[PDB]
Ligand binder design. Structure first.
Ligand code: CA
Ligand code: CA
Ligand code: K
Length: 206
């Protein structure tokens, strides 16, 4: 009497870049009915924000809306092809994985202190620590710290910790508006900057 239409594979897998263009063709999951019927394809579940379009007649699966892997990096679509009959409808499952692009700069924790203090006449003295984070993946969110001024006076480490490079002298200067630069280790790198306000104190004798 009846066989339902059969998808080639009963489970698909697929990478898509988050930068992929709207309208781009992602997968061809057309089935065939052995008694030549017309077939109707629909995404039953797995795509609540309607990111993907699955042609009702063709079978083609394209991208409908823009992706972002910082919001969603994975989808599990439940697709169906049906012929019309009471139970002439079959189910496959597409498994989609979104891959990274470096579309995000480091961002400094706004809650850590900016106003810092270090004693004078002391070198390799701990001034304080900053931190910045990047939501991108792998090297695209590895953050490298550097100083944008006073490089002869202060050094900064990979863990964000800042030190005096040399004995400072309050009488020479007591405030420093230091600048820190967080940069991601991506091939096409992005960065941001934070100004600190460092104050010099003195040992109390002379
Ligand atoms: Ca980044
Ligand atoms: Ca990204
Ligand atoms: K993104």
């Amino acid at each position: 009497n009846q066989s339902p239409p059969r998808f080639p594979q009963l489970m698909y897998s697929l990478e898509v870049s988050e930068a992929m263009r709207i309208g781009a063709i992602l997968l061809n999951l057309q089935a065939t009915d052995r008694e030549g019927d017309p077939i109707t394809y629909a995404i039953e579940n797995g795509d609540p924000q309607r990111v993907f379009n699955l042609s009702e007649t063709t079978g083609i699966l394209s991208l409908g809306k823009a992706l972002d892997r910082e919001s969603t990096d994975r989808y599990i679509l439940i697709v169906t092809a049906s012929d019309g009959r009471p139970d002439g409808t079959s189910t496959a499952t597409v498994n989609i994985v979104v891959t990274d692009v470096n579309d995000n700069a480091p961002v400094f924790d706004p809650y850590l202190p900016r106003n810092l203090s270090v004693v004078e006449e002391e070198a390799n003295a701990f001034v304080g620590q900053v931190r910045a984070t990047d939501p991108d993946a792998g090297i695209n969110g590895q953050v490298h710290y550097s100083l944008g001024n006073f490089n002869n006076l202060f050094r900064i480490t990979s863990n964000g910790s800042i030190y005096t490079a040399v004995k400072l002298n309050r009488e020479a200067r007591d405030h420093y508006e230091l600048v820190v630069v967080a940069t991601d280790g991506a091939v096409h790198p992005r960065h941001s900057t934070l100004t600190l306000y460092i104050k010099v104190l003195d040992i109390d004798l002379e």
